[PDB]
Design an enzyme around this catalytic site. Structure first.
Site, mmCIF file in Angstrom:
data_model
loop_
_atom_site.group_PDB
_atom_site.id
_atom_site.type_symbol
_atom_site.label_atom_id
_atom_site.label_comp_id
_atom_site.label_asym_id
_atom_site.label_seq_id
_atom_site.Cartn_x
_atom_site.Cartn_y
_atom_site.Cartn_z
ATOM 1 N N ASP A 1 -21.413 -35.666 14.205
ATOM 2 C CA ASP A 1 -21.602 -34.195 14.296
ATOM 3 C C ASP A 1 -22.918 -33.759 14.476
ATOM 4 O O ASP A 1 -23.987 -34.398 14.131
ATOM 5 C CB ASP A 1 -21.293 -33.702 12.646
ATOM 6 C CG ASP A 1 -21.391 -32.242 12.863
ATOM 7 O OD1 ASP A 1 -20.663 -31.503 13.279
ATOM 8 O OD2 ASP A 1 -22.413 -31.733 12.162
ATOM 9 N N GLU B 1 -20.973 -34.983 19.013
ATOM 10 C CA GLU B 1 -20.788 -33.511 19.356
ATOM 11 C C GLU B 1 -22.206 -33.367 19.814
ATOM 12 O O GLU B 1 -22.960 -32.840 18.858
ATOM 13 C CB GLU B 1 -20.515 -32.453 18.156
ATOM 14 C CG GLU B 1 -20.318 -31.050 18.609
ATOM 15 C CD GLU B 1 -20.976 -30.223 17.570
ATOM 16 O OE1 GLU B 1 -21.779 -30.715 16.872
ATOM 17 O OE2 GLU B 1 -20.949 -28.864 17.672
HETATM 18 O O1 LIG Z 1 -23.393 -29.753 10.530
HETATM 19 C C1 LIG Z 1 -22.216 -29.095 10.974
HETATM 20 C C2 LIG Z 1 -22.235 -27.639 11.997
HETATM 21 O O2 LIG Z 1 -22.451 -28.401 13.263
HETATM 22 C C3 LIG Z 1 -21.262 -28.436 14.554
HETATM 23 O O3 LIG Z 1 -21.539 -27.680 15.740
HETATM 24 C C4 LIG Z 1 -22.703 -27.346 16.051
HETATM 25 C C5 LIG Z 1 -23.505 -27.910 16.895
HETATM 26 O O4 LIG Z 1 -23.778 -29.195 16.760
HETATM 27 C C6 LIG Z 1 -24.856 -27.052 16.943
HETATM 28 O O5 LIG Z 1 -25.601 -28.029 18.254
HETATM 29 C C7 LIG Z 1 -25.050 -25.621 17.382
HETATM 30 O O6 LIG Z 1 -24.535 -25.545 18.709
HETATM 31 C C8 LIG Z 1 -25.268 -24.493 19.672
HETATM 32 C C9 LIG Z 1 -25.769 -25.214 20.708
HETATM 33 O O7 LIG Z 1 -26.840 -26.257 20.461
HETATM 34 C C10 LIG Z 1 -26.401 -24.109 21.555
HETATM 35 O O8 LIG Z 1 -26.980 -24.851 22.569
HETATM 36 C C11 LIG Z 1 -25.537 -23.073 22.021
HETATM 37 O O9 LIG Z 1 -24.632 -23.634 23.161
HETATM 38 C C12 LIG Z 1 -25.007 -23.021 24.326
HETATM 39 C C13 LIG Z 1 -25.251 -23.798 25.405
HETATM 40 O O10 LIG Z 1 -25.819 -24.860 25.408
HETATM 41 C C14 LIG Z 1 -25.396 -23.121 26.674
HETATM 42 O O11 LIG Z 1 -25.511 -23.770 27.852
HETATM 43 C C15 LIG Z 1 -24.302 -22.016 27.016
HETATM 44 O O12 LIG Z 1 -24.132 -21.400 28.056
HETATM 45 O O13 LIG Z 1 -24.408 -21.005 25.753
HETATM 46 C C16 LIG Z 1 -24.133 -21.747 24.314
HETATM 47 C C17 LIG Z 1 -24.138 -20.627 23.445
HETATM 48 O O14 LIG Z 1 -24.153 -19.375 23.783
HETATM 49 O O15 LIG Z 1 -24.473 -22.555 20.902
HETATM 50 C C18 LIG Z 1 -24.131 -23.593 20.284
HETATM 51 C C19 LIG Z 1 -23.072 -22.953 19.095
HETATM 52 O O16 LIG Z 1 -24.027 -22.057 18.288
HETATM 53 O O17 LIG Z 1 -24.279 -24.874 16.459
HETATM 54 C C20 LIG Z 1 -22.793 -25.620 16.346
HETATM 55 C C21 LIG Z 1 -21.621 -24.634 16.229
HETATM 56 O O18 LIG Z 1 -21.821 -24.481 14.767
HETATM 57 C C22 LIG Z 1 -20.042 -28.563 13.689
HETATM 58 O O19 LIG Z 1 -18.788 -28.920 14.288
HETATM 59 C C23 LIG Z 1 -19.834 -27.270 12.854
HETATM 60 O O20 LIG Z 1 -18.614 -26.745 12.386
HETATM 61 C C24 LIG Z 1 -21.022 -27.070 11.712
HETATM 62 O O21 LIG Z 1 -21.133 -25.828 11.094
#
Ligand SMILES: OC[C@H]1O[C@H](O[C@H]2[C@H](O)[C@@H](O)[C@@H](O[C@H]3[C@H](O)[C@@H](O)[C@@H](O[C@H]4[C@H](O)[C@@H](O)[C@H](O)O[C@@H]4CO)O[C@@H]3CO)O[C@@H]2CO)[C@H](O)[C@@H](O)[C@@H]1O
Ligand SMILES: OC[C@H]1O[C@@H]2O[C@H]3[C@H](O)[C@@H](O)[C@@H](O[C@H]4[C@H](O)[C@@H](O)[C@@H](O[C@H]5[C@H](O)[C@@H](O)[C@@H](O[C@H]6[C@H](O)[C@@H](O)[C@@H](O[C@H]7[C@H](O)[C@@H](O)[C@@H](O[C@H]1[C@H](O)[C@H]2O)O[C@@H]7CO)O[C@@H]6CO)O[C@@H]5CO)O[C@@H]4CO)O[C@@H]3CO
Ligand SMILES: OC[C@H]1O[C@H](O[C@H]2[C@H](O)[C@@H](O)[C@@H](O[C@H]3[C@H](O)[C@@H](O)[C@@H](O[C@H]4[C@H](O)[C@@H](O)[C@@H](O)O[C@@H]4CO)O[C@@H]3CO)O[C@@H]2CO)[C@H](O)[C@@H](O)[C@@H]1O
Ligand SMILES: [Ca+2]
Ligand SMILES: [Ca+2]
Ligand SMILES: [Ca+2]
Ligand SMILES: [Ca+2]
Ligand SMILES: [Ca+2]
Ligand SMILES: [Ca+2]
Ligand SMILES: [Ca+2]
Ligand code: NA
Length: 585
Positions: A336, A366
């Site tokens: 994760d 992920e």
């Molecule tokens: O620990 C448990 C939690 O985390 C997991 O999922 C999360 C991701 O690991 C974390 O990286 C973040 O994700 C964000 C991206 O890092 C961020 O870049 C963005 O994504 C962009 C993308 O890179 C860009 O190219 C695109 O066009 O737009 C996107 C966003 O507008 O957003 C991501 C989402 O925020 O947060 C994750 C989601 O919570 C677990 O699976 C989660 O369930 C847990 O809470």
């Protein structure tokens, strides 16, 4: 008013050749069936000797023998008890009964994401009570999962979380408590007990299915106590100030079993809450530094952030992962938030765990990065050849499709098509973050979702993932099952792109193995909405071979010529715009 309420089978359904009767249920009681026929649509013959029987408002038709692979139409004309007349029909397709014999060692691999966010909450609990005990339910469904094609199941995080019985499992509290100790208000996790879990693992293995653990290694939450911590002078917030940080974890309900390691401030680089001032921010601890990550300053996400430069912490987390594999007998991990974790530690840990047993452990991170070249760069930065990653770049194409994409460009989309990286791609259409009711991070793939699964499921490279919410909750199973059949029995040998894709149609060929009879397939997916059937001249790589559409959408067969070419077809609609053509024998 007179109309068909429902039928068994439902129109468009795929049925067993052992089906004995069809039942039509109408709105009024029936008086006469004036006309009735069951037609084989390929040879255009009405079957003789069929029979029927009226029981109030239902009509039961039988006395027939269905042929595997044929498409059929049942035509009727009825008169109800008010002298209303009604003309209609249902149609259907009969599963094949002799499928290609694919050797064990070469059967395609497919994963089920075995959860979603809202499981056992709201009306989900009401309509799906079986999901109040997921470990129990998987043990129960294991046989039918195996029959569906699945070779692995990714479980939700199985250890205790700060929200106790309500933690979807990302609020990581204790990795060593798999629902076995009285911690956080419950002995069990949301999903069940350790016993039940162990039991589920056995059932699944019993049916030749692998079990992956969702390892949440980035942070911890739910501290047993708070400590006074000085913040570093290059902290972004409150530099050089004393805060009160929830960083003390001794796990008392567990009392030292499996590991007597305990956590304090010195095990973390920082946190996001100060209980003196009662204010969030991003607080780095004195003399600590953020760990090396792919992108600059992405170590902090939420929670007390773990310090992977700390050796005692490294050593416990390596031990736990060896335990999960060699003691509790899991077969792999989803990592994760893998991009917010010291990439030196992810390589070290993956290697220590892998070297620890002879089973070939499986790792998917992920790393939520939507450009393919960024994602390649990530995988190069970590430098562990075992690391596969979810293909977020490809899903971005499926988001494009919501309102129309240039369908030809699927030839080159995703990691799953980057030369050198295709087999490190774990492909998927939605998940617990992309499709959730409230608070979602993106838009779900709410339109053309079947086209998208048809693409990932038929593809020669990567390993595709089906989302539980899609299969069981959103009522897509019947359709999904036909695409799982395609993958299980037909999607084999070389893949081939074709030379006539366009704005609205993408096609793709699996030739089959040259020493297995009856395998291979030709896919057509479309984003068209014109409502009409459309054809494409494609080389199937199987000369003089009769093909049929196992989706039941097109009611024709296509026979290739001496070179392999035939004119294969698809319907231009959101709703049915996918067809998978396979051999009849
Ligand atoms: O620990 C448990 C939690 O985390 C997991 O999922 C999360 C991701 O690991 C974390 O990286 C973040 O994700 C964000 C991206 O890092 C961020 O870049 C963005 O994504 C962009 C993308 O890179 C860009 O190219 C695109 O066009 O737009 C996107 C966003 O507008 O957003 C991501 C989402 O925020 O947060 C994750 C989601 O919570 C677990 O699976 C989660 O369930 C847990 O809470
Ligand atoms: O309705 C409020 C709350 O309800 C639920 O939280 C449960 C939780 O699931 C239980 O485990 C328990 O919490 C314990 C912890 O186990 C224990 O470690 C300690 O917690 C401390 C935290 O470690 C620390 O973060 C801090 O909490 C702050 C927090 O950082 C702030 O963001 C703010 O909290 C907000 C939440 O973020 C927000 O989502 C919601 O809270 C829910 C929660 O979703 C749910 O799981 O609203 C609050 C703001 O109102 O403030 C808190 C502090 O005010 O400090 C805590 C200790 O203060 O202690 C808690 C028990 O207090 O019980 C809770 C409550 O039912
Ligand atoms: O059979 C008809 C349709 O079949 C398939 O549709 C699926 C979706 O692909 C699934 O994702 C799900 O749909 C959810 C959706 O995920 C969820 O967010 C919510 O939909 C919102 C949506 O977020 C929002 O953007 C807006 O447009 O309104 C929607 C209405 O709430 O709920 C949906 C469930 O109703 O399940 C559906 C139905 O099975 C296939 O994709 C389609 O091509 C086809 O028409
Ligand atoms: Ca029969
Ligand atoms: Ca981190
Ligand atoms: Ca550090
Ligand atoms: Ca190994
Ligand atoms: Ca678009
Ligand atoms: Ca288009
Ligand atoms: Ca073959
Ligand atoms: Na860190």
């Amino acid at each position: 008013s007179l109309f068909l309420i429902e039928s068994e089978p439902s129109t468009g359904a795929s049925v067993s050749k052992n089906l004995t009767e069809i039942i039509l249920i109408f709105s009024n009681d029936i008086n006469k069936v004036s006309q009735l026929a069951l037609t084989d649509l390929i040879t255009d013959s009405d079957i003789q000797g069929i029979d029927y029987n009226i029981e109030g408002n239902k009509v039961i038709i039988n006395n027939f023998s269905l042929e595997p692979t044929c498409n059929y139409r049942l035509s009727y004309e009825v008169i109800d008890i008010y002298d209303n007349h009604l003309q209609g029909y249902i149609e259907f397709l009969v599963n094949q009964s002799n499928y290609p014999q694919i050797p064990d060692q070469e059967v395609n691999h497919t994963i089920l994401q075995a959860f979603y966010w809202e499981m056992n909450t709201g009306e989900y609990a009401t309509e799906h009570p079986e999901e109040a005990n997921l470990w129990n339910l998987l043990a129960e469904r294991a046989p039918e999962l195996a029959e569906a094609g699945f070779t692995a199941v990714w479980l939700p995080p199985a250890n205790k979380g700060m929200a106790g019985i309500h933690d979807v499992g990302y609020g990581t509290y204790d990795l060593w408590d798999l629902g076995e100790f009285d911690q956080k208000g419950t002995v069990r996790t949301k999903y069940g007990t350790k016993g039940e879990l162990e039991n589920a693992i056995d059932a699944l293995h019993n049916n030749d299915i692998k079990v992956y653990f969702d390892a949440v290694l980035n942070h911890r939450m739910g501290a047993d106590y708070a400590e006074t911590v000085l913040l570093d002078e290059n902290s972004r917030d409150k530099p050089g100030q004393y805060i009160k940080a929830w960083t003390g974890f001794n796990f008392p309900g567990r009392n030292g079993e499996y590991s007597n390691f305990t956590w304090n401030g010195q095990c973390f680089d920082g946190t996001d809450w100060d209980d003196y001032s009662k204010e969030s921010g991003k607080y780095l601890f004195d003399e600590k530094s953020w760990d090396w990550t792919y992108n600059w300053d992405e170590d902090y996400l939420m929670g007390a952030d773990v310090d992977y430069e700390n050796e005692a912490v490294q050593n416990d987390v390596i031990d736990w992962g060896q335990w999960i594999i060699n003691n509790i007998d899991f077969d792999g991990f989803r990592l994760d938030a893998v991009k917010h974790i010291d990439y030196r530690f992810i390589d070290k840990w993956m290697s220590a765990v892998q070297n620890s047993s002879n089973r070939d452990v499986f790792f998917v991170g992920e790393a939520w990065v939507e450009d393919v070249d960024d994602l390649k760069g990530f995988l190069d930065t970590v430098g562990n050849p075992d690391l596969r990653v979810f293909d977020f770049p490809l899903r971005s194409f499926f988001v494009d499709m919501l309102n129309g994409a240039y369908m030809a460009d699927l030839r080159n989309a995703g990691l799953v098509n980057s030369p050198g990286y295709e087999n490190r791609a774990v492909t998927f259409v939605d998940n617990h973050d992309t499709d959730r009711d409230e608070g979602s991070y993106t838009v779900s793939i709410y339109s053309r979702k079947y086209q998208a699964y048809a693409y990932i499921l038929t593809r020669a490279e990567g390993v595709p993932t089906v989302y539980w919410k899609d299969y069981y909750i959103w009522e897509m199973k019947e359709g999904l099952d036909k695409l799982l059949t395609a993958r299980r029995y037909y999607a084999y040998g070389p893949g081939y792109e074709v030379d006539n894709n366009d704005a609205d149609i993408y096609s793709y060929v699996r030739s089959g193995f040259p020493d297995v009879a009856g395998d291979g397939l030709v896919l057509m997916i479309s984003d068209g909405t014109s409502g009409n059937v459309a054809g494409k001249w494609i080389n199937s790589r199987q000369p003089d071979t009769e093909f049929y559409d196992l989706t039941g959408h097109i009611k024709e067969h296509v026979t290739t010529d001496s070179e392999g070419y035939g004119n294969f077809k698809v319907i231009k609609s959101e709703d049915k715009g996918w067809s998978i053509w396979v051999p009849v024998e």
